Design a protein around this ligand. Structure first.
Ligand SMILES: Cc1cc2c(cc1C)N(C[C@H](O)[C@H](O)[C@H](O)COP(=O)(O)OP(=O)(O)OC[C@H]1O[C@@H](n3cnc4c(N)ncnc43)[C@H](O)[C@@H]1O)[C@@H]1NC(=O)NC(=O)[C@@]1([C@@H](CC(=N)Cc1ccccc1)c1ccccc1)N2
Lengths: 133, 666
């Protein structure tokens, strides 16, 4: 019903290796060349990646900023409201980004700000200009 | 098996079913009620048991009926029919036994048997037992034919058959009780030794063997499951198939490597795209940090846009630093996945040069058993006689196999040194024309009712013929002769003054250097009481080594043995003999094999008797005149001694039926 274990013999393969006198040597060479071809392709991309790895040396260590640890506040200083309006102008509806810019406002307080100061800060106009870019 | 059921097994018969031959002789019983069949079967089985329990004395009808019980001994004509059938077809009272009723005073019919091999001698004894006039014509100065035994001093070694292939259902088991055969079991263990002269470690001595067995099953799969049996109109051989299987195993090995290194490039190229994204991000981070720095240099107090710029760029920087860290995360995963794949590659090669050589020994061994290059064997049929293999350990005849044909030859009219030249067969009878081998011009004529031809297949194959048939054998017979394979294997007998090998090791292999020479002195036997080593020449080597002198052959033998046991532990041989079976004119080979393009049916065709045309036109259909026995005629046991023995018994039965009549079929 089935070939021995670790033995490989398909109807397709038998016909290919017995198509002529040296169809055996032909098939085994096409794969011998295919192996060499793929093997040097490996060292090529190995060499390419080796150079790319060296250009990333040091990482991003001299570019990291220390962690700003500030507690979330409920009240809006005029300063914070003005930061918000500008953050909306630059980020639109990315409530996470806006929250990070202001520093001490939760993602929900940011969403609340949108409805509360909606008319007074023409947030409709501010949002429609964000989409204009 | 034991009892009456064991006796059936020991006679190669199903204990609970009637054979085709039995159906022919007892058509009344087999077509009749089941109860009678079981009575028949028991009578048959019990009679066999009686003969088997004591094969040194003749078992008569009287003695048989005496030891039978009710309700089996009630029908005496049934018992007489059964006994007669068994005696006629040589299932009981065959070989060498003491006769109770001394032979009939005058003989009926006259038979000439060509060749006093085992098949010839087996028939001769039977026909004489049936009261026929029998004369054997042997070309050699000895009986036995392909059972040849070298004898000198205390050195005794077989140049022909050597092994009893298991006693379980072997007619030679019966013979061995009748003849003083010193039967010694063969210990299976066979250590191999490479060209260098050093053992193959149990590690490799199993990778290769197991692979060999695996490669055989693979060819069987190619034959039966993929119907790969004809290629370019030519029939596929076992060798051809083994080569194709090996090539596909080498193909798969490469297929595996390709797709493994293909797994590497895909992952390596994922790394390339990631490192590009990382270099471009470290670029934006570099610039963005500068921008934040410059916005921080603007010292307070500042308006809200300037304050926003600091905060905005701060957010934008940590956001891009979030990404880069998640990209360095991915880099670690992909970077170790590459050390994963590079740690475990697939198989480098299918078989190494060392491996392929040890495999070639296993092929040589197979080429030895079948006495022929694997490229000659039929893929579909090469092992057609596997189902009929006997049970038990293989044994060797320690006192020399010749003891058997010599014992059979006793009390028989055998003309030695008599070479049959022509066989003439006509509706009225036969004449066999033979000459004296010593002075070939001295001619003999033999007139007989029947001829039993036991000429080897090699002889029958000769072109131009060594024996002429008048009229010529029919096309269906000669075509079978051509189609059938007649192989070759040779032996080298080495006689020493002392044992220098492992005495508890019966056989050990020597691995050749090339495929071409795999058969050359590949195996050595330690079987005899005396210090004798026996060297085998198989496969393509056999035919070639016959053109080389004995000294050169023994030279290569000593060379090999020195490599294995030490250059000073191997003395010069006191006596040496080399067989040349293909060269032998009375053999022209060693034994038959199922050639590519042949089948087991050809063995049946070989066994079919020849019936001459009528003398006077319009005269009734003549009696069959020319009969064939021998190793090459027995489909289920070819290329053996028991097979030859059995073919003799077969023909003697058929001939006696024809010329003395079958009184047991009524
Ligand atoms: C070296 C060698 C080794 C072994 C054998 C052969 C050789 C050579 N065999 C085969 C076995 O030896 C043979 O089959 C039988 O002995 C043959 O008996 P015939 O049919 O009677 O044929 P003859 O030639 O004897 O009689 C003919 C006579 O005619 C005369 N004459 C000629 N011309 C003229 C003329 N013009 N005018 C007048 N006369 C003429 C001739 O002079 C001659 O006298 C073995 N048989 C066996 O049972 N055991 C063995 O060990 C094995 C042997 C058996 C075997 N191979 C098993 C097997 C199984 C499945 C597939 C294939 C093979 C073996 C056992 C274990 C391991 C390896 C081998 N070894």
């Amino acid at each position: 019903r089935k070939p021995p274990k670790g033995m490989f013999l398909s109807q397709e393969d038998v016909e290919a290796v017995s198509a002529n006198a040296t169809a055996a040597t032909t098939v085994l060479r096409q794969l011998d060349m295919e192996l060499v071809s793929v093997k040097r392709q490996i060292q090529n991309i190995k060499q390419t990646n080796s150079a790319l790895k060296e250009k990333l040396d040091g990482g991003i260590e001299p570019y990291r900023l220390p962690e700003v640890i500030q507690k979330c506040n409920a009240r809006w200083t005029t300063e914070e409201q003005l930061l918000a309006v500008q953050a909306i102008r630059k980020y639109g509806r990315d409530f996470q980004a806006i929250s990070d810019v202001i520093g001490n406002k939760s993602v929900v307080q940011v969403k609340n700000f949108f409805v509360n100061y909606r008319r007074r800060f023409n947030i409709d106009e501010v949002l429609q200009e964000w989409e204009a870019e | 098996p034991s009892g009456v059921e064991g006796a059936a097994f020991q006679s190669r018969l199903p204990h609970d079913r009637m054979t085709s031959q039995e159906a022919a002789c007892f058509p009344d019983i087999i077509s009749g009620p089941q109860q009678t069949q079981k009575v028949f079967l028991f009578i048959r089985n019990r009679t066999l048991q009686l003969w088997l329990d004591n094969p040194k004395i003749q078992l008569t009808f009287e003695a048989t009926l005496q030891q039978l019980e009710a309700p089996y001994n009630s029908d005496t004509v049934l018992v007489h029919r059964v006994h007669s059938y068994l005696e006629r077809h040589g299932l009981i009272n065959f070989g060498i036994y003491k006769r109770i009723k001394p032979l009939p005073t005058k003989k009926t019919g006259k038979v000439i048997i060509i060749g006093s091999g085992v098949s010839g001698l087996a028939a001769a004894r039977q026909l004489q037992s049936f009261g026929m006039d029998v004369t054997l014509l042997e070309a050699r100065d000895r009986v036995g034919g392909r059972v040849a035994t070298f004898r000198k001093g205390n050195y005794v070694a077989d140049l022909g058959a050597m092994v009893v292939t298991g006693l379980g259902g072997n007619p030679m088991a019966v013979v061995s009780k009748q003849v003083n055969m010193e039967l010694a079991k063969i210990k299976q263990k066979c250590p191999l030794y490479e060209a260098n002269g050093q053992a193959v470690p149990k590690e490799k001595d199993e990778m290769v063997e197991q692979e060999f067995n695996r490669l055989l099953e693979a060819t069987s799969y190619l034959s039966h499951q993929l119907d790969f049996n004809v290629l370019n109109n030519k029939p596929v051989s076992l060798g051809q198939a083994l080569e194709v299987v090996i090539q596909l195993q080498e193909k798969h090995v490469k297929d595996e490597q390709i797709e493994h290194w293909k797994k590497i490039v895909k992952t390596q190229e994922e790394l390339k795209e990631l490192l590009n994204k990382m270099v471009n991000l470290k670029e934006k981070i570099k610039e963005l940090h500068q921008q934040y720095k410059e916005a921080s240099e603007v010292k307070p107090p500042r308006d809200i846009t300037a304050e926003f710029l600091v905060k905005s760029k701060h957010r934008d920087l940590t956001a891009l630093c979030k990404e880069y860290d998640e990209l360095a995360e991915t880099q670690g995963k992909l970077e170790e996945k590459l050390q994963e794949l590079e740690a475990n590659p697939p198989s480098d090669v299918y078989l190494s040069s060392r491996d392929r050589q040890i495999l070639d020994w296993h092929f040589a061994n197979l080429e030895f058993a079948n006495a022929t290059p694997l490229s000659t064997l039929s893929l579909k049929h090469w092992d057609q006689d596997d189902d009929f293999e006997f049970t038990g350990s293989h044994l060797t005849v320690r006192n020399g196999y010749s003891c058997v044909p010599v014992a059979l030859a006793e009390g028989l009219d055998i003309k030695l040194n008599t070479a049959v030249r022509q066989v003439r067969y006509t509706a009225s009878g036969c004449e066999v024309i033979a000459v004296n081998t010593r002075s070939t011009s001295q001619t003999f004529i033999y007139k007989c009712d029947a001829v039993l031809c036991t000429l080897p297949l090699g002889v029958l194959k000769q072109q131009p013929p060594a024996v002429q048939f008048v009229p010529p054998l029919p096309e269906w017979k000669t075509s079978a002769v051509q189609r059938m394979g007649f192989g070759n294997l040779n032996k080298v007998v080495l006689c020493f003054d002392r044992v220098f090998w492992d005495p508890s090791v019966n056989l050990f292999g020597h691995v050749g250097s090339t495929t071409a020479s795999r058969g050359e002195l590949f195996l050595f036997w330690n079987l005899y009481k005396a210090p004798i080593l026996l060297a085998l020449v198989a496969g393509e080597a056999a035919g070639i080594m016959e053109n080389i002198s004995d000294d050169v052959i023994v030279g290569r033998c000593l060379a090999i043995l020195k490599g294995i046991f030490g250059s000073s532990a191997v003395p010069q041989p006191k006596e040496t003999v080399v067989s040349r079976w293909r060269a032998d004119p009375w053999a022209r080979g060693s034994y038959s094999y199922v050639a590519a393009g042949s089948s087991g049916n050809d063995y049946d065709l070989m066994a079919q008797p020849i019936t001459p045309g009528p003398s006077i036109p319009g005269a009734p259909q003549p009696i069959p005149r020319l009969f064939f026995a021998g190793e090459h005629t027995i489909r289920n046991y070819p290329a053996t001694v028991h097979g030859a023995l059995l073919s003799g018994l077969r023909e003697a039965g058929r001939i006696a039926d024809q010329f003395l009549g079958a009184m047991y079929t009524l």
